[PDB]
């Protein structure tokens, strides 16, 4: 019943730099352990009995902490390091932090677009999807806005964004906007416009249905 | 040596049980206890309970007694556990995994098993080439999708050409509307490979037993 606190959820850290990763505790703490949680991935021991590097694990990473208080320091950030951290402690029963999120602060990056009409095969079925890709942009926030003939659409669109990337800490995000054949027999003009911090000027592909 | 390997992904419809396996090799079974994780997507890791196997003894996080039931079988190395009367807030991914003496650390861990808890039902994916728009494409290098349309529970699994083509890949983690899962994914690659050379997605969905290979076409 030691509850655990991270804090910040998500910590910003420029590469190459030394960042401290933190652990709050209700109570005083006798030894606290960390895991490295990848995208996709089971968690992983990083630190345990509060500064015991476990096997294998790089030496930039190091354990620190008393009473009710305790650090994972890395302290050279590289662009793996993208993963949740998760301290963990017993008193009774084991109790976990919520985690923090480490997002790597590289330079930021534009979003390269690419548009995709309809395939026959959906067409056939009576639907029709038009996705737009919008890729290896930095930081992740980035709004897509779609417009059918110039004006925008917003009901049935779908967007899913990548976790930050281990190599170049870029994210993607893909949208799908979903129309019936005949919604989208209806229009000619398509077009996916992304507005990225980097630029005010939206980054755009369009393509006509008749063409 | 030390591995922890689990049960597939499970459906299950609200109410119902679902039993989770933990397979344990490459050390005496009942020298440790098998610990168990809940994971939901936004709630950090949460410890479940325990079992010893051998002399069997259990110990449960009072938030989950009458919810987890552990067993363990030492003839098999298998470790279990029973949830019952499920619910959407059990839906997570669940792990077991294992330490040392007493108050330890989870130096080890299963890889996970996926747990959906919903009445909706199994549906097999529709799988769609994105072909670039007609005419020709920016600069030296070519953006082909796959989008993966109308299916339930995850997971899918996506690649391209088999495997063999890993990069410049981006798989779009999926999304729900209405019972129904939407995936895509991106490869981006030199104008010279394509389409002079054969670029297919491949699909799979298990639960349905899918799987569907896509040849992306130029239009």
């Known amino acids: 019943q030691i509850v655990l606190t991270q804090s910040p959820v998500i910590m910003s850290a420029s590469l190459g730099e030394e960042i401290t990763l933190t652990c709050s505790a209700s109570?005083?703490?006798?030894?606290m352990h960390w895991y490295q949680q990848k995208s996709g991935t089971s968690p992983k021991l990083l630190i345990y009995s509060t500064s015991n590097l476990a096997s294998g694990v790089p030496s930039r990473f190091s354990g620190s902490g008393s009473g009710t208080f305790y650090s994972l320091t890395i302290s050279s950030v590289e662009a793996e390091d993208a993963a949740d951290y998760y301290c963990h402690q017993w008193s009774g029963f084991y109790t976990f932090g919520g985690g923090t999120k480490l997002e790597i602060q590289r330079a930021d990056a534009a979003p390269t677009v690419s548009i995709f009409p309809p395939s026959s095969e959906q067409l056939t079925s009576g639907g029709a999807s038009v996705v737009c890709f919008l890729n290896n942009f930095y930081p992740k926030d980035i709004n897509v806005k779609w417009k059918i003939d110039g004006s925008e659409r917003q009901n049935g669109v779908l967007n899913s964004w990548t976790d930050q990337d281990s190599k170049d800490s870029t994210y993607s995000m893909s949208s799908t906007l979903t129309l019936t054949k005949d919604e989208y027999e209806r229009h000619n003009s398509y077009t996916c416009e992304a507005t990225h911090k980097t630029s005010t000027s939206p980054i755009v592909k369009s393509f006509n249905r008749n063409e | 040596q030390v591995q922890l390997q689990q049960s597939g992904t499970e459906l299950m419809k609200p109410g119902s049980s679902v039993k989770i396996s933990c397979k344990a090799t490459?050390?005496?079974?009942?020298?440790?206890?098998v610990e168990w994780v809940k994971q939901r997507p936004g709630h950090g890791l949460e410890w479940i309970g325990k079992i010893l196997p051998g002399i069997g003894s259990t110990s449960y996080n009072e938030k989950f007694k009458g919810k987890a039931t552990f067993t363990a079988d030492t003839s098999s190395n298998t470790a279990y556990m029973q949830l019952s009367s499920l619910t959407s807030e059990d839906s997570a991914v669940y792990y077991c995994?294992?330490?040392?003496?007493?108050?330890?650390?989870?130096?080890?861990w299963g890889q996970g098993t996926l747990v959906t808890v919903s009445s909706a039902k199994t549906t097999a994916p529709s799988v769609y080439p994105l072909a670039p728009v007609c005419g020709d494409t920016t600069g030296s290098s070519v953006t082909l999708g796959c989008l993966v349309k109308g299916y339930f529970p995850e997971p899918v699994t996506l690649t391209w050409n088999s495997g063999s083509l890993s990069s410049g890949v981006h798989t779009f983690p999926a999304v729900l509307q209405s019972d129904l899962y939407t995936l895509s994914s991106s490869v981006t690659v030199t104008s010279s490979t394509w389409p002079s050379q054969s670029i297919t997605c491949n699909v799979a969905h298990p639960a349905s037993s899918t799987k569907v290979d896509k040849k992306i076409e130029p239009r």
């Open positions: 490459g050390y005496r079974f009942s020298s440790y206890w």
């Open positions: 109570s005083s703490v006798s030894y």
């Open positions: 995994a294992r330490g040392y003496y007493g108050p330890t650390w989870f130096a080890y």
